[PDB]
Amino acid sequence: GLVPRGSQILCVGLVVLDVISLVDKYPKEDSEIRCLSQRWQRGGNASNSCTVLSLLGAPCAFMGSMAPGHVADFLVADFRRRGVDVSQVAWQSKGDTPSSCCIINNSNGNRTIVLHDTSLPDVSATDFEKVDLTQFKWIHIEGRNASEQVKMLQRIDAHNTRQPPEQKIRVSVEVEKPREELFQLFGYGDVVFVSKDVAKHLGFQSAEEALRGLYGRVRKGAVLVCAWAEEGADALGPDGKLLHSDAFPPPRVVDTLGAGDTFNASVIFSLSQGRSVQEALRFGCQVAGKKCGLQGFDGIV
Amino acid sequence: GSQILCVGLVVLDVISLVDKYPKEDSEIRCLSQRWQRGGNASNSCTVLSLLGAPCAFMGSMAPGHVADFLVADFRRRGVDVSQVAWQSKGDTPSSCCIINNSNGNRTIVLHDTSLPDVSATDFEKVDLTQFKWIHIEGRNASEQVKMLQRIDAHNTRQPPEQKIRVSVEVEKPREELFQLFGYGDVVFVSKDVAKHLGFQSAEEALRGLYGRVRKGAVLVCAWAEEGADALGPDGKLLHSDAFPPPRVVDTLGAGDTFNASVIFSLSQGRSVQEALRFGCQVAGKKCGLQGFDGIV
Ligand SMILES: c1ccc2ncncc2c1
Ligand SMILES: c1ccc2ncncc2c1
């Protein structure tokens, strides 16, 4: 169908089928057991943010790798359940669609996780070349395979070079895995999200340390953003003023899975509506705080 | 009477192959992944099929994309699905199976949906004339005893030439089931049940459990890498060494493979000793492979 030009927010990243089982006790090897309950869930960073953008009322699209098959089928139907545009998926001829198994030990809250295999090629710069960008007002990249994503980021840069300033496509970038390859991505994006977990691995002990210690790495004009769960969130832009919002914790914490993807999408959404950085931090924190008191994404409204 | 009918579960097995069993609380990446049609009676049908025996499956299934994948697998294998009891309430069961590639150990977490079990009602409605053999996977004992009495009743009416041979599996250490020992020409009891009942080996499990079987039956008990044993009316213990592959890479379904192979051999007129060796021979071959293709 027809997508009006410059109307969609695109997220590029992982999607994965998560199978989650609740058990009485951790299973002894070679044993056969019944779980208390079991869920199949669409997972992944870029994937979660798409769900949030849709619920927020943004037209949105996902770009990631899948292989034809039943896993893909379940994931595509869930994507569509959430009003996500999947027309830019990069279908592969090799590899598994990512899927993962999690066992939550009911009597201690321990999570044991068999992560997906590593057989499916990530999205390539050549896959990205084939995409017509005019559809997109904002493009967001979950850092994964950096060297290739750098080329995608240069391609978008190139595109914007030729556009009026009101046909420019905004870009955001997430570095959430403490992996050296990823650190080059700081150089790209109007907006750069760094995770608490990454900040801590570089040895910063607070959002303020992280932002002040990393800002030197961002491109001129960029805003660097870092959320620290219960401690709220900071951003830092070209004017050197450290901004902050306190968390908006919920009555009780139910489910924090994907809370960070909820923050990222809300910040992106707010800014894409022309709100200020300060306004976006706050909204980001409000939405993510709500999410933490809910099971899944139903009701973050 | 040319078909063999197995009555039990079908389940989506969501399989992850790992280097080593995960420690509590850890997070390991797996080597590979697959979907596989599981369920004791379903695996046995796969194996029977591959052995060249026309066979049919009977069990509950809820309509869906899962079901669609299961059914499509059955047909690739030429397994007759005609007898399935489709439900409305409940979904198809599924499980996460971890297969330790360093020893073929398999660990199963099963999501047993509520989905209604096959019933005496459902069973009374089946044309027993097409069936040479009927194997029943212990599950809902109260109603399966009913299905058994049915088959015997039918049997009392036919010649020795035209009787329907019957086998029972008792796999879970579960009291309701322990009355199933009293039916069938051939009774399969798992190692796991054997141990949960105090018995330390297969021979001890057999001498200790023969009192429970109907008169003239054969009690079978396999024990993985120690092979399997059987005991019949004549009082003579039979043993077969295992046929272990040099590398064990996947034991998910080895037991169902052994059961189905014993049954094939028996329904082909071979001695119990021979059917025992064949059982171990095929099970063993299965354990050196991923899945079921390649066992024949
Ligand atoms: C993100 C993660 C955890 C949180 N806990 C409380 N309040 C807000 C949060 C945001
Ligand atoms: C079950 C059945 C047969 C086997 N053969 C070899 N090793 C392990 C086995 C487990």
DSSP secondary structure string, A170-198?
EEEEEE-S--GGGGGGGGS-SEEEE-HHH
> How far apart are the C-alpha atoms of B204 and B52, rounded to whole Å?
34
Report the topology of domain B1-296.
UDP-N-acetylmuramoyl-L-alanine:D-glutamate ligase (3.40.1190)
CA distance B32 to A117: 6
The C-alpha atoms of residue A24 and residue A110 are separated, in whole angstroms, by 11
DSSP B177: G
Distance (Å, rounded) from C-alpha A167 to C-alpha A164? 5
Q: B69 with A70: CB under 8 angstroms?
A: yes
φ, ψ dihedrals at B224, nearest 5°? 55, -125
For the domain spanning A1-301, the CATH number is: 3.40.1190.20
Q: Which two tokens stand for residue B281?
A: 């021979």
A68 CA to centre of own chain: 23
The residue to which tokens 């139910």 are assigned: A254
CB contact under 8 A, B31 and A117: yes
Task: Give the determination technique.
Answer: X-ray
Burial of A93 (0-12, 13-18, 19+ CB in 10 A): exposed
- CB atoms B107 and A31 under 8 Å: yes
Count CB atoms within 10 A of the CB of residue B26.
Answer: 12
How would you classify residue B171: left for phi > 0, otherwise alpha for psi between -120 and 50, otherwise beta?
alpha
Report the alpha-carbon distance of residue A82 to residue A79 in Å, rounded. Answer: 5
**A32 touches B: beta carbon within 8 Å:** yes
Strand pairing class (B228-231; B218-222): antiparallel
Given the structure tokens 């050197």, which residue do they identify?
A240
- Looking from the CA of residue B244, the nearest atom of ligand 2 is 6
Task: Please indicate if the annotation marks A83 as binding a ligand.
Answer: no
CB A167, CB A199: distance < 8 Å: no
H-state helical runs in B253-293 = 254-266, 272-287
Q: Which amino acid is at A182?
A: L
Q: Give the integer Cα–Cα distance in Å for B56 and B82.
A: 8
User: Measured between CB atoms, does B114 come within 8 Å of chain A?
Assistant: no
CB within 8 Å of B28: residues ≥ 6 apart: A113, A114, A115, B18, B19, B20, B22
Residues of B in contact with A36 (CB under 8 A): none
**How far is Cα A103 from Cα A9, in angstroms, rounded to an integer?**
34
Helix, strand or coil, per DSSP, at residue B215: coil
Which residues is A98 bridged to in the sheet?
none
Indicate the resolution in Å: 2.5
| Residue B101 per-residue DSSP state | T
Contact B143, B180 (CB under 8 A): no
Give the distance, in angstroms, between the CA of residue A46 and the centroid of all CA atoms in the same chain.
4
Strands B60-61 and A242-245: unpaired
How many C-beta neighbours within 10 Å does residue A156 have?
21
What tokens appear for A19 in the block?
């199978």
- Tokens for A10? 């695109």
How many other CB atoms are there within 10 angstroms of residue B110's CB atom? 20
Q: Between A and B, how many residue pairs show a Cβ–Cβ distance under 8 A?
A: 87
Percentages of chain A per state (helix, strand, coil), in multiples of 5: 35, 25, 40
The reply to whether ligand 2 has any atom less than 6 angstroms from the CB of B291 is no
- In sequence order, the 6+-apart residues with CB closer than 8 A to the CB of A25 are A105, A107
Give the residues across from A203 on adjacent strands.
none
What part of A 168-227 touches B (C-beta under 8 Å)?
Answer: none
Radius of gyration of chain A measured on its C-alpha atoms = 19
φ and ψ at residue A286, rounded to 5 degrees:
-60, -50
Q: Write the residue in A33, A103, A115 that is nearest to B28 by C-beta.
A: A115
Of residues B154, B155, B117, B165, the one with CA closest to residue B138: B117
Report in angstroms the alpha-carbon separations of B23 from A106, B14, B105.
16, 20, 15
β-pair partners for B237:
B231
Instruction: Please give the residue of chain B at the shortest CA–CA distance from A97.
Output: B33
Angle between helices A259-272 and A45-56 (to 10 degrees): 50
CA terminus-to-terminus distance, chain A: 26
Ligand closest to the CA atom of residue A261? 1
- Helix, strand, coil % over all residues of chain B, rounded to 5: 35, 25, 40
Beta-carbon neighbour count of residue B42 at 10 Å? 26
Nearest to A224 by CA among A213, A237, A242: A237
User: Among all chains, which residue has been given the structure tokens 């005991």?
Assistant: B231
Q: What angle do CA A108, A113, A115 make, to 5 degrees?
A: 170
DSSP A247: -
- Return the structure tokens found at A36: 């208390």
CA A17 to chain CA centroid, Å, is 15
Pair type for strands B94-100 and B106-111:
antiparallel
Residue B242, ligand 2, Cβ within 6 A: yes
> Three-state DSSP class for B29?
strand
Helix or strand or coil: residue B213? coil
**If you take atom 3 of ligand 1, which residue's CA is the nearest one?**
A229
Long-range contacts of B214-219 (CB under 8 A, 24+ apart): B214/B182, B214/B183, B214/B184, B216/B185, B217/B184, B217/B185, B217/B186, B217/B187, B218/B185, B218/B186, B218/B187, B218/B272, B219/B187, B219/B189
- Give CA–CA dist A185/A218, Å, rounded: 9
SS3 B179: helix
Q: Are B262 and B240 contacting, i.e. CB atoms less than 8 angstroms apart?
A: no
DSSP A84-131: -B-TT-EE-SSSPPPEEEEEEETTT--EEEEE--S-SPPPPHHHHHTS
Nearest alpha-carbon partner for A258 in A41, A97, A70: A41
Query: What is the distance in angstroms between the CA of the first residue and the CA of the last residue of chain B?
Result: 25
Taking contacts as CB-CB distances below 8 angstroms, the residues of chain A near B108 are 31-33
Q: Write out the two tokens for B60.
A: 């509950």
DSSP of A26-67: PPPTT-EEE-SEEEEEEE-HHHHHHHHHHHHT--EEEE-EE-
* Alpha carbon nearest to ligand 1 atom 4, residue: A229
Choose among A274, A292, A187: nearest CA to A230.
A292
Select from A32, A70, A101 the Cβ nearest to the Cβ of B69. Answer: A70
Give contacts of A32 with chain B, Cβ < 8 Å.
107-108, 110
| Three-state secondary structure call for residue B181 | helix
Q: Which ligand minimizes its atom distance to the CA of B245? A: 2
Ligand 2 and B224: CB distance under 6 A: yes
- Do B112 and A34 count as a contact with CB atoms less than 8 A apart? yes
> With left for phi above 0 and alpha for psi between -120 and 50, is residue B290 left, alpha or beta?
beta
Q: Is A110 on the interface with B (CB under 8 A)?
A: yes
- Which atom of ligand 2 is least distant from the CA of B280? 3
Residue B112: is it exposed, middle or buried by C-beta count within 10 angstroms (0-12/13-18/19+)?
Answer: middle
Residue of B nearest to A110 (CA): B25
Q: Exposure string (b/e) for B209-225, b if CB count within 10 Å is 16 or more?
A: bbebbeeebbbbbbbbe
Residue B234: Cβ-neighbour burial (10 angstroms; 0-12, 13-18, 19+): exposed
Considering only the beta carbons, identify the residue of B28, B32, B105 that sits closest to A119. Answer: B32
Q: Is A231 annotated as a binding residue?
A: yes
Residue A79 gets the label, from left (phi > 0), alpha (psi -120 to 50) or beta, of alpha
Q: Which residue has the tokens 């619920």?
A: A55
Task: Give dist(CA B160, CA B231) in Å, integer.
Answer: 22
Distance between B252 CA and the closest CA of chain A, angstroms = 9
Contact B61, B69 (CB under 8 A): no
| Exposure of B241 in the CB half-sphere (CA atoms within 13 A) | 3
How far, in Å, CA of A197 to CA of A36, rounded?
A: 31
Q: Which helix (H) or strand (E) holds B5?
A: strand B3-7
From the candidates B9, B23, B24, B26, which should be mutated to test the interface with A, based on the most A CB atoms within 10 A?
B24
Contact A158, A191 (CB under 8 A): no
Residues of B in contact with A96 (CB under 8 A): 32-33
* CA distance linking residue B126 with residue B142, whole number of Å: 19
The SS3 assignment for A139 reads strand
Residue B290 DSSP one-character state: S
| Residue B85 burial (10 A CB sphere; 0-12, 13-18, 19+) | middle
Q: Which residues contact A300 (CB under 8 A, 6 or more apart)?
A: A52, A55, A262, A287, A290, A291, A294
Q: Residue B181 has which token pair?
A: 């020992």
| Distance to chain A for B174, nearest Cα, Å | 13
- Looking only at the bridges linking them, the beta strands covering A111-115 and A99-105 are antiparallel
As a whole number of angstroms, the distance between CA A241 and CA A246 comes to: 16
* A230 labeled binding residue: yes
Ligand 1 site-directed mutation target among A52, A197, A230, most atoms within 8 Å of CB: A230
